[PDB]
Amino acid sequence: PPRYGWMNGQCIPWDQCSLHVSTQAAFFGASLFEGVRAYWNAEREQLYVFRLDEHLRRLEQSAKMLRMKLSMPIADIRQGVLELLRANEFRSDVHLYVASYFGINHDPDPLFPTDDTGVYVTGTAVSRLPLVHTGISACMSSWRRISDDSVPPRIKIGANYQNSRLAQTEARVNGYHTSVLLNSRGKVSETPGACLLMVRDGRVISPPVTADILESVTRKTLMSLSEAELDSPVIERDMDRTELYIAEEVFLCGTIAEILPVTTIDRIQVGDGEVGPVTRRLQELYFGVTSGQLEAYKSWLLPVY
Amino acid sequence: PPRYGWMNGQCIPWDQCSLHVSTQAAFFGASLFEGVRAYWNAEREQLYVFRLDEHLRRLEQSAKMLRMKLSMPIADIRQGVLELLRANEFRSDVHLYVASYFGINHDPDPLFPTDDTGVYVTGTAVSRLPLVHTGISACMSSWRRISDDSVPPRIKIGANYQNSRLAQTEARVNGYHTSVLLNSRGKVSETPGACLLMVRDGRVISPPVTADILESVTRKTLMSLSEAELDSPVIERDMDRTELYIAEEVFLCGTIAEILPVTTIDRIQVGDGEVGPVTRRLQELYFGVTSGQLEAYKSWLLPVY
């Protein structure tokens, strides 16, 4: 485990990174959060946080819809990420959670938000799953994705993961790495913890932001890279379940997930069942960008030391 | 605030009733819980927990769907409720939360449930809102109720309250005590924290358990009372929004809510705008039962001292 976490402006022993059970955060999962990765480059001896700004922008914007006042400005939270990476002396890849959470209730009504707000940042060392090279199996879920006008999947909040937990538990129980949820219009949305893209007739295709998905930072990154580097704009259109059986390639992306090739869906082979060239190409760009090997994209990276 | 709470088999100072931020409970709101009320009877000097068994039965059954192993048997949790009421020396009405929660992750996948499980019980003194006598205003919500095959409202888990928080925040922002959500079939489901019933053509009517509601203990109680005492079985049928404008009465029920008469919906007067006779009658029965004044129903009550 790591030595420290960071809460409300200071590093503190990991041991005592705690919320009272009566806080809205602990009880309801009412924490708005961002997953952020830092990538270690051995040649150079540097750690690069990836697109922290896009993450912080999304947190601040999501806080509006929740009527949640940030406990401190995002600039200070940026400072926090730095303090935390450094206090733990991480010399490898790191997964971070940066959170703004509701605290103790200020009101007789327990379902109304409070003004008592805090922030914390957690990081743990991680390394790349061999599944990134191998490819994974997915199944279609029996669960339907939560809807925008009910519990918006566009807000990355602790509470919104129940829909994910059910889909993901079922997938694993049935022998798959993950599953694909249809939304209430019967179209492809995403996977419990990652956006889904496919290749058909030479084009990269992904569901639009109205398909009940989170608007992934990694998704947006791949869209830019496909456009700028492969001269292949990603087409955002609704997708059907049965298209995945005929696509040339399918793969998933997100901060934690990185880029995961999907080689079987419900045990049907995607294309010829191998990791596809577009996937590989996008993996090469993405790993290149995040580790700081491609100068053109350097302004996405925050050096830590 | 109360002096103690109860966690994992023991009373401990309220101050240190805490979860680590990395627990599934803290982060996702992955706590299965029951609201339970204890009622103080001044003549007699006794505290009666109401229908604890029905609450414990629902918790254990809900734990199955979540693949959550109870940390201890329900009999021990019953013991816990007693220990806690007594350690705090409560001599008035009490609201309790009894919770089984997921702890630290045992698995690389953060969306898969762990076997590290605990339980806790919280209680605070409360007293009856004057709104029980006055009646409240409701509005129809712009938010739609979460669905069974997405995030089941039948499971009372921390995480499932986001849908409630949004509806309830909006209600209060707009000058109402609460709101009524339609489900995805466009029918009446419930209110953020209470089931809804109405009276039309002399009959008490409530949405069925397939309208995306929690199967309320208070709901079931009122159904028995209406049947046994008023000779008026509650009819369980879908209800439309526009029926509430023409009903003779509307009222809400749940543990925390008790029985709340609803005298306006979207500022339209329900019936003649006064608390209705059926509501009053059901309030009299319900307050009679819970405080231990009606011997016929004594076996619903658990005496504490």
Ligand SMILES: *Cc1c(COP(=O)(O)O)cnc(C)c1O
């Ligand atoms: C966080 C998340 C993703 C990944 O998005 P990023 O912004 O790339 O981290 C995808 N889907 C869901 C459901 C998520 O919560």
Ligand SMILES: *Cc1c(COP(=O)(O)O)cnc(C)c1O
């Ligand atoms: C707990 C709850 C109720 C009330 O049910 P009881 O079993 O009477 O306590 C009603 N609706 C919702 C959404 C709830 O979570």
